[PDB]
Design a protein around this ligand. Sequence first.
Ligand SMILES: COC(=O)c1c(C)n[nH]c1-c1ccno1
Ligand SMILES: COC(=O)Cc1cc(O)cc(O)c1
Length: 208
Amino acid sequence: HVETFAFQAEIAQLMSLIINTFYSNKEIFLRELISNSSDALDKIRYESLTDPSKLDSGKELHINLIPNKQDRTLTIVDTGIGMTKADLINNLGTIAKSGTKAFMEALQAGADISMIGQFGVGFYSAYLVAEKVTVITKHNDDEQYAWESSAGGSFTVRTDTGEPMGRGTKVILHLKEDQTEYLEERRIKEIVKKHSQFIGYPITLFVE
Ligand SMILES: COC(=O)c1c(C)n[nH]c1-c1ccno1
Ligand SMILES: COC(=O)Cc1cc(O)cc(O)c1
């Protein structure tokens, strides 16, 4: 069944900032997730170096960007370490909760949002483009989970029953009505080339 959680009020508060503040340079939302995905392919390249039985859930280490116009969705799939329940529910909430304050202190004093990454809170970047985000993730030690939040204070998590994804994180952006420009191949290739040309993992932009 579906469990409902509340955001730590600092996370809540953040998500509003992102959602309601005027900021036109939204495309950066994507290199944050690319980057994030690289950070989770790093973690598992590394661990498998000592324990190669960790790759039994999938030898192949790659990023996939998937645009779906009919759904209004860009998913960023990745074969990374993945997230456990304790991750989704309590461990991420914890780290995120410092990243948030620093990021927000650093805001008057005129840093800005394209910098949310140097603060550990990149993932929340999605909220620039996404009206609801759905994380489908699969760790080696735990069950497969779906996390979802349309923001506004609360997130859900359930055990998934979709395609068994083997090991990874899929992040399905359910884009707002006026942001469909990131559903366009020509527009996705330009951001990748601009902001993520050095990611040491195969990035595959699916066409439609
Ligand atoms: C994949 O989505 C996430 O990365 C996530 C979740 C599910 N909770 N918190 C976070 C997070 C990201 C960055 N800092 O925190
Ligand atoms: C830094 O920790 C995290 O944010 C987990 C995470 C893993 C991933 O494969 C993609 C993400 O967007 C986030």
